[PDB]
Amino acid sequence: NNQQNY
Amino acid sequence: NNQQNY
Amino acid sequence: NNQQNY
Amino acid sequence: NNQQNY
Amino acid sequence: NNQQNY
Amino acid sequence: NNQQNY
Amino acid sequence: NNQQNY
Amino acid sequence: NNQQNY
Amino acid sequence: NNQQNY
Amino acid sequence: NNQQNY
Amino acid sequence: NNQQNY
Amino acid sequence: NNQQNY
Amino acid sequence: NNQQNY
Amino acid sequence: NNQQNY
Amino acid sequence: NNQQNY
Amino acid sequence: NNQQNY
Amino acid sequence: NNQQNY
Amino acid sequence: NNQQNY
Ligand SMILES: [Zn+2]
Ligand SMILES: [Zn+2]
Ligand SMILES: [Zn+2]
Ligand SMILES: [Zn+2]
Ligand SMILES: [Zn+2]
Ligand SMILES: [Zn+2]
Ligand SMILES: [Zn+2]
Ligand SMILES: [Zn+2]
Ligand SMILES: [Zn+2]
Ligand SMILES: [Zn+2]
Ligand SMILES: [Zn+2]
Ligand SMILES: [Zn+2]
Ligand SMILES: [Zn+2]
Ligand SMILES: [Zn+2]
Ligand SMILES: [Zn+2]
Ligand SMILES: [Zn+2]
Ligand SMILES: [Zn+2]
Ligand SMILES: [Zn+2]
């Protein structure tokens, strides 16, 4: 699973 | 699993 | 931010 | 930030 | 920041 | 598992 | 920062 | 497991 | 900073 | 396991 | 800083 | 295990 | 700094 | 195990 | 600084 | 085991 | 500084 | 085991 917070 | 906080 | 992998 | 891998 | 690997 | 906090 | 590997 | 705090 | 390897 | 605090 | 290897 | 505090 | 190797 | 405090 | 090798 | 305090 | 080798 | 205090 992937979570990216820019 | 991956979490990246920029 | 929160990521939980059960 | 929080990442928990159970 | 917190990372816990059970 | 990977957590990166920039 | 905290990393715990059980 | 990997945690990097920049 | 804290790293614990059980 | 790896923890780097820059 | 703290590193404990059990 | 590795912990580096720069 | 503290390193304990049990 | 390795701990380096710069 | 403290290093204990049990 | 290795601990270096610069 | 303290180093104890049991 | 190695402890170096610079
Ligand atoms: Zn942003
Ligand atoms: Zn940011
Ligand atoms: Zn699962
Ligand atoms: Zn699991
Ligand atoms: Zn596990
Ligand atoms: Zn930042
Ligand atoms: Zn384990
Ligand atoms: Zn920073
Ligand atoms: Zn273990
Ligand atoms: Zn820094
Ligand atoms: Zn052990
Ligand atoms: Zn520093
Ligand atoms: Zn032992
Ligand atoms: Zn320094
Ligand atoms: Zn021993
Ligand atoms: Zn110094
Ligand atoms: Zn002995
Ligand atoms: Zn000195």
From Swiss-Prot, chains A, B, C, D, E, F, G, H, I, J, K, L, M, N, O, P, Q, R:
Lineage: Eukaryota, Fungi, Dikarya, Ascomycota, Saccharomycotina
Name the record gives this protein: Eukaryotic peptide chain release factor GTP-binding subunit
Domain note: The prion domain (PrD) is a Gln/Asn (Q/N)-rich domain, which is unstructured in its native, soluble form, and which forms a parallel in-register beta-sheet in its amyloid form.
Something else known: [PSI+] is the prion form of SUP35. [PSI+] is the result of a conformational change of the cellular SUP35 protein that becomes self-propagating and infectious. This conformational change generates a form of SUP35 that assembles into amyloid fibrils. [PSI+]-aggregates sequester soluble SUP35, resulting in defects in faithful translation termination by read-through of translation termination codons. [PSI+] can be cured by GdnHCl and by deletion of the molecular chaperone HSP104, which is required for [PSI+] propagation. Present with 78900 molecules/cell in log phase SD medium.
Subunit structure: Heterodimer of two subunits, one of which binds GTP. Interacts with polyadenylate-binding protein PAB1, and TPA1.
Domain of life of the source: Eukaryota
Protein family membership: Belongs to the TRAFAC class translation factor GTPase superfamily. Classic translation factor GTPase family. ERF3 subfamily.
Organism of this sequence: Saccharomyces cerevisiae (strain ATCC 204508 / S288c)
Function of the molecule: GTPase component of the eRF1-eRF3-GTP ternary complex, a ternary complex that mediates translation termination in response to the termination codons UAA, UAG and UGA. SUP35/eRF3 mediates SUP45/eRF1 delivery to stop codons: The eRF1-eRF3-GTP complex binds to a stop codon in the ribosomal A-site. GTP hydrolysis by SUP35/eRF3 induces a conformational change that leads to its dissociation, permitting SUP45/eRF1 to accommodate fully in the A-site. Recruited by polyadenylate-binding protein PAB1 to poly(A)-tails of mRNAs.
Location of the protein in the cell: Cytoplasm
Portion of the parent chain present: 8 to 13 of 685
